[PDB]
Design a protein around this motif. Structure first.
Motif, PDB file in Angstrom:
ATOM      1  N   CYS A 799       0.809  -1.206   0.000  1.00 41.78           N
ATOM      2  CA  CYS A 799       0.000   0.000   0.000  1.00 41.78           C
ATOM      3  C   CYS A 799       0.848   1.264   0.000  1.00 41.78           C
ATOM      4  N   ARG A 868       3.060  -3.228  10.894  1.00 41.74           N
ATOM      5  CA  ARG A 868       1.972  -2.830  10.016  1.00 41.74           C
ATOM      6  C   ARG A 868       0.730  -3.643  10.328  1.00 41.74           C
ATOM      7  N   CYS A 873      -4.150  -0.132   6.538  1.00 39.00           N
ATOM      8  CA  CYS A 873      -3.821  -0.376   5.141  1.00 39.00           C
ATOM      9  C   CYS A 873      -4.495   0.664   4.272  1.00 39.00           C
ATOM     10  N   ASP A 874      -3.742   1.204   3.321  1.00 39.91           N
ATOM     11  CA  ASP A 874      -4.227   2.292   2.488  1.00 39.91           C
ATOM     12  C   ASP A 874      -4.879   1.787   1.210  1.00 39.91           C
ATOM     13  N   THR A 875      -5.027   0.480   1.051  1.00 37.99           N
ATOM     14  CA  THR A 875      -5.559  -0.043  -0.196  1.00 37.99           C
ATOM     15  C   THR A 875      -7.056   0.186  -0.269  1.00 37.99           C
ATOM     16  N   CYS A 880      -3.506  -4.809   1.270  1.00 37.14           N
ATOM     17  CA  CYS A 880      -2.279  -5.110   0.553  1.00 37.14           C
ATOM     18  C   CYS A 880      -1.540  -6.273   1.210  1.00 37.14           C
ATOM     19  N   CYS A 883       0.614  -5.368   4.601  1.00 42.37           N
ATOM     20  CA  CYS A 883      -0.107  -5.011   5.809  1.00 42.37           C
ATOM     21  C   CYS A 883      -0.927  -6.153   6.387  1.00 42.37           C
TER      22      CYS A 883
END
Ligand SMILES: [Zn+2]
Ligand SMILES: [Zn+2]
Lengths: 1335, 99
Positions: A799, A868, A873-875, A880, A883
């Motif tokens: 991510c 993490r 998670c930035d997905t 991702c 993470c």
RNA sequence: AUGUUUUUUUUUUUUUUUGAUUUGGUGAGAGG
DNA sequence: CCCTGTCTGGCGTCCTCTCACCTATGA
DNA sequence: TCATATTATTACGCCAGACAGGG
């Protein structure tokens, strides 16, 4: 083939376009013959011909003219399944509003026409009139009218005046409702008001008003004008065994609607009066409303006998609708079922499968094989051959079995290890032979269990059974890192008897040139299986880079340890077998074999373990007798000493010296002590009973008692069960919940008499009722968890972030409970961990922490790792690959694709059965002190007292890691200080919780500010001491003349000037709360650490209340903003609390219910995340106050506390991802330059991609606010209505999706299980990559 | 008990239940979640389309097996079209969009 | 060397392929 | 007008096996 | 046989969600 499924309202033109003919007559069939009705419900022209390509009546009996329709038949000419897709329509004489849009809570027509539900129904059931654009009269548009209100109006406004009723009137209202016009008005109304309630009431009305304009849904489509009828084939009319037709319930519903509609058409022909056609249209309205959703109106109609009949909505909703009964779970061909049995000769990739089931499940493969050879010709011949079962089809069967796996499945499948694929080995018999180790995965004993076999037909499914679901591939449980092919019960007894020792046997202390002649000496009859012996073993240690180096040596070991060394593979050291090998030791033997030598030696070594365990358990002859349960000789004297003690306590009870509760407590305490002494007597008498001599005087050893090896090996038995078979079986408890003061002093080897067995039956009936009712909540918890997860698929590889939660070891206040290596095993670090010395790159910033990295973490004693987490998670739309973490049943990272939401939900909900359903600080170790959240002051005596409530007292060792932690209250007597070294066991803290200290910072003299005896405080001179104290009253006992007076103490100097706080210019005045008693009186000089007043004062439903996120009944209240605090209004419902920040804006306040014992004073400054009262704390407050990482730490700690109290190992990834699925929705605060609304709740990935494609431009984004929905509210609030309709209530979700015009871009697991295609997680993730790429 | 192929119900195209009726095993909800837990996307696809419900899929599959071609031509389940007609028989217009 | 030298009704219609072996709700009880 | 009892709806485990029982009326 | 069309029991346990009442 097709993308998204679109749902919308049905226009009357759309319903006439679906249709193929108006269903007039209600007459179902002829019933005396076989023909239907022309033209009734089951028509010919409207639908189709019963027979395929035949006019039912008479013409076309070949295949030439398919379609002709003669006048004598009035019949189409197509297929037998053509009627299943064709639907009819009933021309409802009188308009009838839908029940799904009138009673959905909230009703669709209730918040759209701005009219209360009660008033809507009144008019709808011909009991009230409604105005519609009257004219120049004194009446509103929404305002209704009654008989008296209409009668008078009728004679008054006889001209331009309109006042109808029923659906007709309602329809008009909706029809004549300018949507767009209302939008602006509503929008302007929301921007011209401040009313909180109104704001929410206006935002919910405008949301459904603008959503209707966004789609092609009309307001007049709510009322049903052209009722549609379901296809006959879907409402089947089959006769049962006999001569009558068992008719469906929908035929009763449709036949009544058509009977009533025909009556209403005839009455409107005849011009009946008003009350007749009002009752007729009302009966039609209730008939339509009963057809669509039966029983939502008052008491449901019924045919036979009193049971209500099942309508269309009851064909959709419920446990037995179409989603949960025919679309998510289906009945399945090529499947079988039988009773299981053991068969221990198997290798663990194969199972036994009977010949009769094998010839039935593999009929088409055998047909194909028979047709290939040339033995037969047509298919019939092959079916006669296997119907006769000749001598040649068994070779055909062994040639279709060979490399073709099957899916064995135990009937309550809870996690993914309950469907495993084997290779069949054919069985003379009728029972599935199942390899024993695999049983511990299925929770399958052999007490009458049954399993189902399924055949992977196609070629991709055979490869999925061999490459993903094979039983050799599932050797680690996906919930953690623990092996699931652990040897269960017989084999650990065979090993524990094999690798053990005794102080003299045959061949004591002889020397052997290898393990081969160790087994040769055991078999020939010259030594014993346990006889200590120097052997020469050659262990292969692989110390180089993939090279195995031989080292041979003489180990002082036994005969059995050498025989078991003949089975260990090369790389493991000899010390894995040198010990006694219980169950924990054999589990870590297989675990070290899997971590070193990989998969294939661990599979073959698991089989060789099982074979040698069974063989030497057979050679052991390890029975159980009546003499094996050795009664302690000291047991009777212990019972007589306890009987003398209860005699002393009851002789005090006759003379009344002691209280009754203290008597009950003393009796339960001495019977607990006597129970522990009896258990220690029997445990010594079992664990070292054998005393055998060797060449002289005696010498003792651990016993070879049979029940002791069954307990010490960990095969079956514990301390408690072997305790109840020899020592007394404790103090059983009655179902009142309190314990019984007279225990069950007799074990099971002695006889229980009658009363003792009856108390035992209390204790055991409660346990059986708890399991048999607990299982329903456990299963429903797994269902809610896999339907909130349901979507989340590993869809990236990084991510690209630097955020992640801070994994520390958890410490409750005892010894350090769960070490850091259990929490940061196989999870990828967020930033690079500094070595604890100074600023070193010990590990880099994106390394997976497997066992080698975790050992180099434990050597350096690393404090805590920023790692993490899935919730960070930035997905967008998935998680991702970094993470998530390690694969957990594979050694590597999670693959791109593997569905982690479902395995996580199963791994949390699967242990739901094992869980239950229904002074000061004393240090333990010896180390260094450290304080956090501390603001302190030294008193006059020297003990550092604390001016902060929330102080954390850590005990840090000499290495750097944190070993202990405690919470120290406001104003406690600390025996120690900051950074100090203590001794083990020394008391370091002291306080009085029954007396809230009002200790100071400075010294001086005491004045009574606003303390007047008579109104503020009262005079209560003490009775038994004489040293009086002016008792402070509360704000409720004193009257309204002096209720405004706040008693307080402010410290001055020797002159009288106010001694200021060091650091400010404010004096230190302490406002005394209610129910206080003044300790130090007037004129007495004070110091720090001296009080100014005396202030007197979980198992499985806990897991449910954490994931569903209920509030506790008395939550801990907090502060939404920092700054100074004060009180407010005197008891109008609640007592106010005003927080004015130092720099921030003031106007936040909160009305506290005044039944709580507070924590804050008037001169105290607060912070966000800082407590104001005490008790449990709701997760919404954690989320909106502290942070997202705070609430994910709160849930994972508060549910690993339940799973650790009951002793289940679950990794935290699963709880972090269900926490992600809880807080997926968000709410807007500032709309910004986007297209959202002010207080609109929108999902987080949507608003983030919106302002991330706008922030990449010049425009600055939108600022959101995350919200935490509970799991059933969060899975029902999804952007995919099939996902929220396969789950709980389908009525609410389908009406919301219908009136919103919602569309389901499928994009998840259960939409594709419904619609019948590949899952977008597993093998189908490449297919969905391809399809998403090719758009 | 075992079943390869025989008779089914009327309303639905799925196999009958029981032993006295020569019927197959209900592959229930938690087994579908267990196949989703693995990567069994093709095993689940034949487990709910070809082996159970889709009539064109199962006749093509029986002929494909006895020819010697383990390959499924899936199509759409019949009970989902039964769902579409029961939902559509309300005042609800549920559809199937663009190619 | 030679054969119109004992004629009379002792009578001509198939299978055809084109399709399948058939059982719904309610309530009670048991196994795991 | 913000708390508040009070009322109404909506959940409540999967898989399997055996048996019996099925609307009244009516010139 | 072939159209006619719906009444004299109560005894779950939370848990959200909406609603009239009142300081
Ligand atoms: Zn015809
Ligand atoms: Zn990520």
């Amino acid at each position: 083939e097709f993308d998204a499924i679109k749902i919308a309202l049905a226009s009357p033109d759309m319903i006439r376009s679906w249709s193929f003919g108006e269903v007039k007559k209600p007459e179902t069939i002829n019933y005396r013959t076989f023909k239907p009705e022309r033209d009734g419900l089951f028509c010919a022209r409207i639908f189709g011909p019963v027979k395929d390509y035949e006019c039912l009546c008479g013409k076309y009996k070949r295949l030439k003219h398919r379609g002709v329709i003669c006048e004598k038949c009035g019949v189409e000419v197509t297929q037998t399944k053509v009627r299943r897709e064709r639907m009819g329509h009933i021309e409802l004489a009188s308009p009838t509003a839908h029940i799904w849009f009138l009673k959905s809570l909230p009703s669709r027509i209730g918040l759209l026409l701005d009219m209360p539900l009660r008033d809507i129904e009144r008019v709808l059931y011909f009991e009230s009139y409604v105005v519609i654009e009257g004219g120049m009269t004194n009446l509103e548009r929404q305002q209704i009218l009654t008989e008296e209100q209409y009668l008078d109006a009728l004679e008054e406004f006889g001209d331009e005046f309109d006042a109808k009723m029923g659906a007709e009137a309602i329809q008009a209202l909706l029809k004549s409702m300018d949507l767009e016009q209302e939008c602006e008005q509503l929008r302007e109304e929301l921007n011209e008001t401040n009313s909180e309630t109104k704001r929410k009431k206006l935002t919910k009305r405008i949301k459904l008003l603008e959503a209707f304009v966004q789609s092609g849904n009309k307001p007049e489509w709510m009322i049903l004008t052209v009722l549609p009828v379901l296809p006959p084939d879907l409402r089947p009319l089959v006769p049962l065994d006999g001569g009558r037709f068992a008719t469906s319930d929908l035929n009763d519903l449709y036949r009544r609607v058509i009977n009533r509609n025909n009556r209403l058409k005839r009455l409107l022909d005849l011009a009946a009066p008003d009350i007749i056609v009002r009752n007729e249209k009302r009966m039609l309205q209730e008939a339509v409303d009963a057809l669509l959703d039966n029983g939502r109106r008052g008491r449901a109609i019924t045919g036979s006998n009193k049971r209500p009949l099942k309508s269309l909505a009851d064909m959709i909703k419920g446990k037995q609708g179409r989603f949960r009964q025919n679309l998510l779970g289906k009945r399945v061909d090529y499947s079988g079922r039988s009773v299981i049995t053991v068969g221990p000769y198997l290798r663990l990739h194969q199972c036994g499968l009977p010949k009769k089931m094998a010839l039935e499940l593999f009929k088409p493969f055998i047909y194909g094989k028979l047709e290939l050879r040339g033995l037969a010709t047509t298919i019939k011949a092959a079916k006669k051959m296997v119907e006769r079962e000749e001598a040649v089809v068994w070779d055909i069967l062994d040639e279709v079995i060979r490399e073709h796996p099957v899916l064995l499945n135990r009937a309550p499948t809870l996690h993914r290890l309950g469907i495993q694929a084997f290779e069949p080995v054919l069985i003379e018999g009728k029972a599935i032979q199942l390899h024993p180790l695999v049983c511990a995965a299925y929770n399958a004993d052999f007490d009458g269990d049954q399993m189902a076999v399924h055949v992977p037909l196609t070629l991709e499914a055979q490869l999925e059974a061999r490459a993903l679901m094979m039983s050799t591939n599932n050797i680690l449980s996906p919930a953690n890192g623990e092996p699931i092919i652990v040897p269960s019960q017989d084999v650990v007894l065979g090993l524990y008897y094999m690798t053990r020792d005794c102080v003299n046997a045959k061949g004591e202390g002889m020397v052997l040139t290898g393990p081969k002649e160790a087994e040769r000496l055991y078999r020939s009859g010259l030594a014993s299986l346990h006889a200590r012996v120097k052997v020469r073993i050659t262990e292969y240690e692989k110390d180089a880079n993939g090279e195995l180096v031989a080292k041979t040596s003489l180990k002082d070991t036994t005969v059995g340890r050498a025989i078991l060394w003949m089975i260990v593979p090369k790389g493991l050291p000899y010390s894995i077998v040198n010990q006694a090998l219980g169950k924990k030791a054999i589990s870590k033997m297989l675990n070290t074999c899997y971590r070193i030598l990989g998969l294939k030696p661990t599979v073959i070594f698991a089989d060789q373990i099982m074979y040698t365990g069974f063989a030497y358990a057979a050679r052991s002859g390890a029975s159980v007798g009546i003499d094996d349960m050795v009664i302690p000789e000291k047991k009777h004297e212990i019972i007589s000493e306890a009987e003398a003690e209860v005699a002393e306590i009851q002789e005090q009870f006759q003379s009344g010296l002691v209280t009754a509760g203290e008597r009950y407590n003393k009796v339960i305490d001495i019977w607990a002590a006597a129970n522990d002494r009896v258990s220690k007597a029997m445990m010594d008498n079992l664990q070292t009973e054998t005393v055998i001599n060797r060449d002289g005087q005696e010498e003792k050893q651990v016993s070879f008692n049979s029940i002791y090896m069954m307990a010490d090996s960990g095969a079956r038995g514990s301390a408690a069960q072997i305790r109840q078979l020899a020592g007394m079986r404790g103090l059983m408890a009655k179902p009142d919940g309190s314990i019984i003061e007279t225990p069950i002093t007799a074990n099971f080897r002695e006889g229980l008499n009658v009363l003792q067995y009856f108390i035992s039956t209390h204790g055991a009936r409660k346990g059986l009722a708890d399991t048999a009712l607990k299982t329903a909540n456990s299963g429903y918890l797994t269902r809610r968890l896999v339907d909130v997860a349901q979507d989340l698929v590993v869809t990236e590889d990084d991510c690209g972030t630097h955020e992640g939660i801070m994994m520390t070891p958890v410490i409750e206040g005892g010894d350090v409970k769960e070490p850091l290596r259990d929490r940061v095993l196989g999870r990828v670090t967020a930033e690079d961990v500094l070595k604890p010395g100074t600023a070193d790159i010990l590990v880099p910033r994106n390394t997976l922490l497997h066992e080698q990295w975790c050992d180099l973490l434990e050597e350096n004693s690393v404090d805590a790792v920023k790692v993490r987490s899935v919730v960070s998670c930035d997905t967008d739309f998935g998680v991702c690959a970094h993470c998530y973490g390690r694969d957990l049943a594979r050694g590597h990272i999670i693959n791109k694709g593997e569905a982690i939401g479902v395995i996580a939900a199963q791994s949390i909900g699967e242990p739901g059965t094992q869980l239950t359903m229904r002074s000061s600080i004393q240090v333990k170790n010896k180390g260094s002190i450290k304080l956090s959240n501390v603001k302190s002051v030294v008193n006059s005596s020297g003990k550092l007292v604390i001016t902060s409530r929330n102080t954390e007292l850590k005990l840090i060792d000499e290495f750097g890691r944190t070993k202990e932690s405690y919470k120290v209250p406001y104003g406690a007597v600390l025996a120690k200080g900051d950074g100090e070294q203590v001794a083990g066991g020394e008391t370091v803290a002291n306080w009085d919780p029954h007396t809230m200290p009002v200790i100071t910072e400075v010294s001086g003299f005491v004045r009574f500010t606003d303390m007047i005896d008579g109104q503020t405080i009262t005079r209560q001179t003490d009775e038994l001491t004489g040293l009086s104290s002016l008792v402070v009253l509360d704000s409720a006992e004193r009257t309204a003349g002096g209720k405004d007076l706040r008693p307080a103490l402010k410290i001055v100097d020797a002159q009288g000037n106010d001694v200021l706080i060091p650091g400010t210019d404010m004096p230190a005045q302490y406002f005394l709360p209610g129910k206080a008693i003044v300790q130090l009186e007037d004129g007495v000089q004070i110091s720090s650490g001296d009080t100014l007043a005396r202030i007197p004062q979980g198992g499985l439903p806990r897991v449910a209340d954490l994931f569903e996120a209920r509030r506790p009944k008395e939550p801990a209240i907090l502060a939404e903003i920092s700054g100074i605090v004060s009180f407010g209004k005197e008891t109008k419902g609640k007592r106010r609390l005003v927080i004015t920040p130092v720099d921030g804006s003031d106007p936040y306040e909160e009305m506290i219910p005044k039944w709580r014992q507070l924590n804050v004073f008037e001169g105290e400054r607060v912070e966000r995340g800082d407590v104001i009262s005490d008790g449990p704390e709701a997760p919404h407050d954690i989320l909106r106050l502290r942070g997202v990482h705070a609430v994910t730490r709160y849930i994972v700690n508060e549910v690993q506390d339940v799973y650790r109290l009951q002793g289940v190992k679950i990794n935290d990834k699963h709880i972090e991802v269900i926490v992600r699925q809880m807080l997926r929705k968000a709410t807007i605060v500032n709309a910004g330059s986007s297209d959202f609304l002010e207080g609109e709740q929108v999902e987080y990935s949507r608003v983030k991609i919106a302002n991330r494609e706008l922030e990449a431009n010049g425009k600055v984004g939108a600022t959101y606010s995350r919200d935490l929905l509970g799991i059933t509210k969060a899975s029902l609030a999804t952007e995919s209505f099939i996902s929220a309709a396969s789950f709980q209530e389908t009525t609410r979700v389908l009406t919301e999706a219908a009136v919103a015009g919602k569309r389901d871009e499928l994009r998840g697991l259960k939409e594709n299980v419904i619609v019948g295609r590949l899952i977008p997680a597993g093998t189908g993730y490449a297919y969905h990559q391809d399809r998403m790429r090719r758009r | 008990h075992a079943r390869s192929t025989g008779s089914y119900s009327l309303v639905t195209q799925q196999p009958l239940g029981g032993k006295a009726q020569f019927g197959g095993q209900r592959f229930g909800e938690m087994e579908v979640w267990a196949l989703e837990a693995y990567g069994a996307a093709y095993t689940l696809q034949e487990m709910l389309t070809v082996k159970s419900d889709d009539v064109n899929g199962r006749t093509k599959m029986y002929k494909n097996i006895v020819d010697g071609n383990h390959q499924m031509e899936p199509g759409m389940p019949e009970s989902f079209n039964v769902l579409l007609k029961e939902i559509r028989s309300l005042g609800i217009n549920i559809e199937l969009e663009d190619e």
